[PDB]
Design a protein around this ligand. Structure first.
Ligand SMILES: Nc1ccc(S(=O)(=O)Nc2ccccn2)cc1
Ligand SMILES: Nc1ccc(S(=O)(=O)Nc2ccccn2)cc1
Ligand SMILES: [Zn+2]
Ligand SMILES: [Zn+2]
Ligand SMILES: [Zn+2]
Lengths: 159, 159, 156
């Protein structure tokens, strides 16, 4: 009965010349996200929500860019290590919900693939992982296609 | 004890010649929100939070903005159908919290009416529904009054 | 006791010259500070709104329109009092600060300690996270700082 909630936010710039990787899925698009590794905005937000629910700080405190252990680590490896640390701190994950905000491309065809990657990385049943997607109605840098945002919420319980 | 959390986000442009309908309340104003449905940004954010908590996808999955049957749709009717599907998936709603962010008009006079509408639609008492209203402190497209944003959080439990 | 409730909070304040930068009750050296009627502590405000939201007590604007000169930790303490008054116990708080500058990492642990003391919580039930905005929008240009918060309470 010792439930805890966590919330996560991430954003990355979207420009020509890089791949678009969201939720572990490479998506064909004229632009891609800029960041240290694969720049997976959705997995970063979920990771931060999980560290937050466990009150373990955040993704920057756990996985520094200079650390040799995570030099070439992609964001799924980081999500899996996050989950291991959350479990070791005594918490079981109960569910994850999230939103991707991107003016383009359409993300609906890729939701089930993202959910399957996230559930596998968290060792969760598929029906405890949700990903939602929407545009920003052409408003702001998101609406002009200059960035993509992800939001995440996670519920855990201390066991 | 099988609790789940969900989160929701929505935004719509503020334009001339549209009803301003937020939380089911038709608010007197020279502009209104632009969308395929009645464009109720607050009810959409809450709908997304509820679908997300039940791991049922999102409002685009259940009520496509491409579908003619939803042109001008009453978003309270959509919220009620969302709650019906969430119940059909086995979940009871425990509470909803939300934020509306707008430069104008003043929303304080309308918040209690919005809360009562949401509570009615979700078959909740008033004390389990909360609506918060704020400005964006003059920043960004929200500060310039180009759109209105809503955020939502929901807790459900699988019975 | 299984009557859990969640709340969510959002705040943003402009960064302006000639004012202290106070976030999570920590005074951070910086050329600018946050603009507000209070000390404009955007993180404490977001947490405050999340707590009012979880207890279904409305929001800051309704509670804190005898507080004319109060700093935001006093308001967070008052918020926690009202949450308790309504029969709720706070179970945990999580939050994110979005600021392009300055670096907040050295100050996070003090913010967490401040929030924990104000809410009468142990450290392991309070969390503060910090991000830039990748140089995007008004946050990325350093025109404001945003905070987000989530809170879990239970009605006893
Ligand atoms: N059934 C339905 C519901 C909402 C809309 S909307 O384009 O007015 N608003 C939307 C649409 C998708 C996500 C969020 N808001 C159109 C159709
Ligand atoms: N009592 C009180 C507290 C804070 C403020 S603020 O306008 O500096 N910050 C706010 C105000 C409303 C919602 C969020 N932050 C004004 C009055
Ligand atoms: Zn990232
Ligand atoms: Zn909408
Ligand atoms: Zn504030």
């Amino acid at each position: 009965m010792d439930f805890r909630i966590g919330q996560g936010y991430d954003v990355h710039q979207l420009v020509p010349g890089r791949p678009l990787i969201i939720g572990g899925v490479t998506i064909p698009y004229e632009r891609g996200l800029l960041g240290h590794s694969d720049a997976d905005v959705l997995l970063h937000a979920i990771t931060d929500a999980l560290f937050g629910a466990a009150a373990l700080g955040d993704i920057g405190r756990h996985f520094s860019d200079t650390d040799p252990r995570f030099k070439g680590a992609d964001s799924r490896a980081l999500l899996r290590e996050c989950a291991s640390r959350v479990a070791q701190a005594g918490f079981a994950i109960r569910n994850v919900d999230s939103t991707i905000i991107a003016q383009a491309p359409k993300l609906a065809p890729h939701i089930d693939a993202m959910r399957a990657n996230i559930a596998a990385d968290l060792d969760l049943p598929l029906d405890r992982v949700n990903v939602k997607a929407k545009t920003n109605e052409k408003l702001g840098y998101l609406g002009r296609g200059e960035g993509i945002e992800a939001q995440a919420a996670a519920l855990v319980v201390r066991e």
